[PDB]
Ligand SMILES: *[C@@H]1O[C@H](CO)[C@@H](O[C@@H]2O[C@H](CO)[C@@H](O)[C@H](O)[C@H]2NC(C)=O)[C@H](O)[C@H]1NC(C)=O
Ligand SMILES: *[C@@H]1O[C@H](CO)[C@@H](O)[C@H](O)[C@H]1NC(C)=O
Ligand SMILES: *[C@@H]1O[C@H](CO)[C@@H](O)[C@H](O)[C@H]1NC(C)=O
Ligand SMILES: *[C@@H]1O[C@H](CO)[C@@H](O)[C@H](O)[C@H]1NC(C)=O
Ligand SMILES: *[C@@H]1O[C@H](CO)[C@@H](O)[C@H](O)[C@H]1NC(C)=O
Ligand SMILES: *[C@@H]1O[C@H](CO)[C@@H](O)[C@H](O)[C@H]1NC(C)=O
Ligand SMILES: *[C@@H]1O[C@H](CO)[C@@H](O)[C@H](O)[C@H]1NC(C)=O
């Protein structure tokens with residue numbers, strides 16, 4: 061959760077407090093795909109273990 | 110296949126019928142990376158099972 | 159005659175060394191063992207046989223392979239062009255000697271696309287006579303004259319030893335000529351000599367090419383009793399033409415670095431197996447390579463019959479456009495909107511949109527269209543945009559972030575800026591809150607700036623919100639009145655009304671076609687649908703968001719869409735060392 | 742206090758662009774250090790900064 | 791038209807589906823309309839002079855570019871060399887296998903250049919990233935000692 | 940057998956057409 065993943069911040073409260081929806085959605089999509097990838101990796105590791 | 114994945118639509122026939130290649134390629138890239146991620150998740154689950 | 163291509167059709171797509179790799183390339187190639195049309199320009203040796211002469215017009219597809227078997231440099235050059243007239247440019251190539259002089263200049267000799275190599279008496283031998291058959295004005299652009307001087311014809315009647323392989327492919331206004339030379343042995347057909355074609359010439363030509371022509375040199379010894387052109391009994395050169403196809407080859411390089419072998423990916427099921435497995439060693443067992451996909455036969459287009467022109471003439475140029483603080487809603491309903499005039503009438507300073515693309519506006523259909531026209535400052539033309547926070551234009555006119563539709567802006571200096579002062583154009587300057595995109599605050603109240611009730615009186619910090627535009631007749635660039643109009647193209651799947659007319663092909667059942675229902679570019683068989691469709695919009699969906707049941711706009715028949723026969727091939731093969739037959 | 746309403750009331754700028762904060766949320770946000778650089782350039786240089 | 795094709799031909803236009811062979815009438819207009827320019831017109835109608843350049847970046851022997859220092863070749867020493875934009879860092883050697891008479895560029899499976907040719911001369915070169923391995927700190931616990939291997 | 944028949948009836952293994960059209964096929968077992 062402390063990873064930029066390409067976005068200009070790392071917490072979702074400091075993106076919607078800076079940008080507007082039409083331009084903040086791309087940053088949020090970056091953050092969400094990164095976090096979903098990390099969580100899927102964790103789930104796969106848990107399944108194997 | 111019923112997931113937007115960030116694109117303005119969810120079917121490949123309603124993106125190429127709206128946009129042009131130089132601007133539709135980014136939407137197609139979003140859709141294809143999303144679908145490839147979903148299919149890889151399915152394949153990993155199938156391998157574990 | 160017709161023959162088969164054994165080891166022809168391969169060329170380095172992009173030249174890289176590629177030391178011993180099995181690369182997978184996709185470009186314009188020639189499938190192996192396909193029909194290659196033999197043009198045997200042999201001299202007629204009998205009094206009954208026809209004069210074998212081959213300079214016929216050949217249609218030019220997206221790519222063309224050419225082959226010339228040769229022993230005495232008879233075949234010289236090639237010619238292209240859309241129609242070979244004064245209207246369209248025509249390339250040409252001349253190989254009168256070792257020097258390679260070419261042109262692009264349009265010279266019309268449709269009656270005589272020949273070349274002359276006549277037997278000269280002075281030092282009698284096989285010399286070239288007529289390398290100029292051009293009978294028109296040039297009016298051309300490109301030129302190229304390479305002059306390595308070496309006079310050689312060397313007429314002979316022996317076996318055709320040499321062969322030159324060429325590929326003439328054009329794309330994006332560029333012409334690429336790949337070429338290679340090989341000493342062949344067989345005289346009757348193409349021998350089994352494998353090699354690739356190194357690129358030599360790339361030329362920017364910018365001409366639509368659809369036709370093709372060839373040049374032959376026909377003239378013989380003066381001892382022949384008659385016309386050497388009408389009667390000639392020494393020509394034996396032949397050439398082969400192959401219409402290139404979009405393929406996907408697998409090219410196996412070697413340690414040296416040249417393409418030694420290649421395999422198609424659609425020639426044979428075992429060829430596709432090697433294409434998928436990425437090797438030439440296919441062991442025993444079942445393989446799954448691709449799917450049995452049936453291509454659509456035709457292309458149905460379904461747009462409403464009626465051809466009522468939409469009133470777009472009164473939305474662009476009108477007498478008066480209402481001010482920004484109160485803009486009008488022009489609802490265009492149930493008509494045809496031909497955008498060709500909207501393309502012919504091209505005087506727009508700014509044209510932007512984020513939904514559909516202007517390329518596809520012509521071949522697309524809409525269900526609801528609303529036009530909002532008004533006039534703004536010179537610096538405000540960039541401020542009518544979704545998400546663009548307006549310093550003063552957020553009180554006045556905002557665009558939705560999900561907005562889909564195109565905006566048009568142009569200078570109204572000649573119509574809205576006059577010596578009459580034109581102070582009738584007003585706008586809101588400040589308000590206690592910022593408006594939502596498609597809401598207009600036509601109300602005009604007093605502003606209580608400074609936290610004091612200025613009920614009816616305009617004093618300090620009680621200014622009138624509806625301020626007239628500071629226009630001036632023929633002012634500076636940044637202050638001109640720009641007249642704009644936005645279109646809100648409602649793309650929600652509803653019965654499409656406002657769009658241009660295309661051919662309404664008749665309905666066909668049990669035949670999957672590349673049909674198109676108001677942009678629904680689906681390719682599947684059509685059937686009658688048992689389930690009663692909705693009286694509302696003509697669109698249906700399923701779990702996977704691929705349309706299954708629709709309804710035609712012209713006829714209220716419930717159509718059912720289903721992608722046609724799809725399966726999967728499974729090449730059953732033994733070891734390639736044992737055999738090549740598959741199941 | 743940097744009241745941007747007057748910076749919104751005084752709207753006479755041909756070009757107003759930025760890549761960080763959005764103008765919609767400039768009002769309801771706080772800044773630490775603000776540095777302004779004022780200067781003059783050509784007519785073809787305005788797009789160049 | 792397609793991007794790099796110019797239709798220099800000037801024919802008659804059969805608007806309204808009628809053959810206007812040689813005659814300019816209603817819906818038979820001349821396609822080649824001259825620009826409605828005016829000496830010192832408004833901002834939106836001034837003639838703008840433009841020129842576009844097609845920088846063909848395809849890997850072919852580079853000819854048109856500015857002059858940079860031609861440092862002498864050195865063998866068995868990986869350097870931050872730069873061959874017409876090829877910002878590779880590896881040792882350079884002579885190449886045994888015959889290179890193509892065409893472009894000075896080569897590639898491998900991993901899309902990282904392996905064999906090239908010099909611009910100024912015609913000697914074949916083999917590129918290989920220099921000595922690369924991996925450290926593996928063999929250590930006991932911190933409290934027992936600090937020496938590692 | 941009698942007991943095998945009681946087993947092949949309490950499992951029982953269009954959605955299948957939807958999966959088939961999207962390329963999600965089901966191969967048949969060798970045995
Ligand atoms: C390039 O040239 C071909 C010539 O075949 C053009 O095809 C013409 O298309 C128009 C429009 O459908 C027809 O009316 C003509 O009859 C076609 N020509 C012939 C000889 O039949 C083609 O339009 C040109 N342009 C492009 C982009 O391909
Ligand atoms: C070539 O065309 C002939 C038609 O005469 C046809 O019989 C043949 O199958 C085609 N293909 C080959 C490889 O000959
Ligand atoms: C290159 O071709 C020559 C042909 O003389 C051959 O002997 C050699 O094995 C090939 N490969 C290499 C790496 O030299
Ligand atoms: C466009 O509208 C203006 C009204 O200001 C009118 O004078 C002009 O003739 C119109 N042009 C066309 C082509 O309708
Ligand atoms: C009243 O009519 C005027 C005159 O057309 C118009 O400008 C205004 O928008 C209308 N509505 C209000 C609330 O004034
Ligand atoms: C008009 O609509 C009917 C009903 O589907 C259709 O059969 C006919 O082809 C249409 N007319 C044209 C010219 O396509
Ligand atoms: C072909 O290869 C297979 C696999 O190694 C082997 O079992 C078989 O004997 C070979 N047959 C021949 C004729 O070499």
Ligand SMILES: *[C@@H]1O[C@H](CO)[C@@H](O)[C@H](O)[C@H]1NC(C)=O
Pocket residue numbers: 910911
């Ligand atoms: C460039 O350098 C090469 C190698 O030293 C030399 O052969 C060639 O003549 C030079 N070209 C010049 C000096 O134009």
Ligand SMILES: *[C@@H]1O[C@H](CO)[C@@H](O)[C@H](O)[C@H]1NC(C)=O
Pocket residue numbers: 930931932933934
């Ligand atoms: C660290 O100290 C503990 C005693 O608390 C000892 O048992 C242990 O061996 C020490 N660590 C190592 C790596 O020896």
